[PDB]
Amino acid sequence: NAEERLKMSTTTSTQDSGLLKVLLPPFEKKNNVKVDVIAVGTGQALKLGEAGDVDVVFVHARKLEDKFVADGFGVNRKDVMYNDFVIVGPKNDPAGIAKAKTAAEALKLLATKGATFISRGDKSGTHTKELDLWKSAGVDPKGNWYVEAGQGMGPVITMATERRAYTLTDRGTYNAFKGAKTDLVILFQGLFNPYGIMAVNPKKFPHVKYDLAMKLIDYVTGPEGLKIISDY
Ligand SMILES: [W+6]
Ligand SMILES: [W+6]
Fold first, then answer.
1. Which candidate, 100, 94, 133, places its Cα nearest to that of 114?
2. Environment of ion ligand 2 (residues, CB < 5 A)
């Protein structure tokens, strides 16, 4: 009965996209369960799983996910292809990034123009991607223009908006903020990001809801789940 609850840790950034509000109800109905979404920072989402306080972890942070699995905490990790990265900024695009042909070129235009840019500057898969793209541009971002916020995607979109800055954002969070909570527009866009979904290991935590976690993972990577994710 539901009241029977499965706990999933994720990031605040993934909650903002709104995917879970559409993806979870058919699973809840089919299994007579409630899926509690615990949206916290990336580090905390894994710490919750390391402590056995959730049954499933759903994050986009490849190195950290690998470690979680290597460390024995997570089992049966599956890729969940969803979402993509875009560069947003003021609608008058002073750096002229709309003329960029790749994301590395766009960022290098920013660094060269000295246009204000907000980094997530945290644990997140968005941060890792950003750093990978700076490295592919062969630039190491040092300036004043380069800001490291140490916050989630939502607060970074807000800070970019106040500062009339550019930022690298997942489209999902942007689409959810567009218009109401920013006036920034997509100036550069490109495939999908390999979220990882993982069950907390009941050999480490025998009270975790593993069988129900495994149903969730099967669901999300199954035809119904994929259709929702691709239609979203
Ligand atoms: W409730
Ligand atoms: W994230």
1. 94
2. 11, 13, 124, 126
Nearest ligand to the CA of 4 is: 1
Number of domains forming the structure of the chain: 2
Q: Which ligand is nearest to the CA of 122?
A: 2
- The per-type count for the chain, helices as H runs and strands as E runs, is 10, 10
Neighbours of 7 (CB within 10 A): 20
HSE-CB for 52 with a 13 A CA cutoff: 11
Write the CATH number for 129. 3.40.190.10
Ligand nearest to the CA of 28: 1
Query: Cα(193) to centroid of ligand 1, in Å?
Result: 30
E-state strands within 17-55: 34-40
Dist. CA 202 → ligand 1 center (Å): 25
- The C-alpha atoms of residue 113 and residue 99 are separated, in whole angstroms, by 14
Distance 1 CA to ligand 2 centre (A): 32
201 lies in the same domain as 231 = yes
Tell me which method was used to determine the 3D structure. X-ray
Resolution (angstroms) stands at 1.8
Could you tell me if 93 and 155 lie in one domain? Answer: yes
CA distance 139 to 189: 20
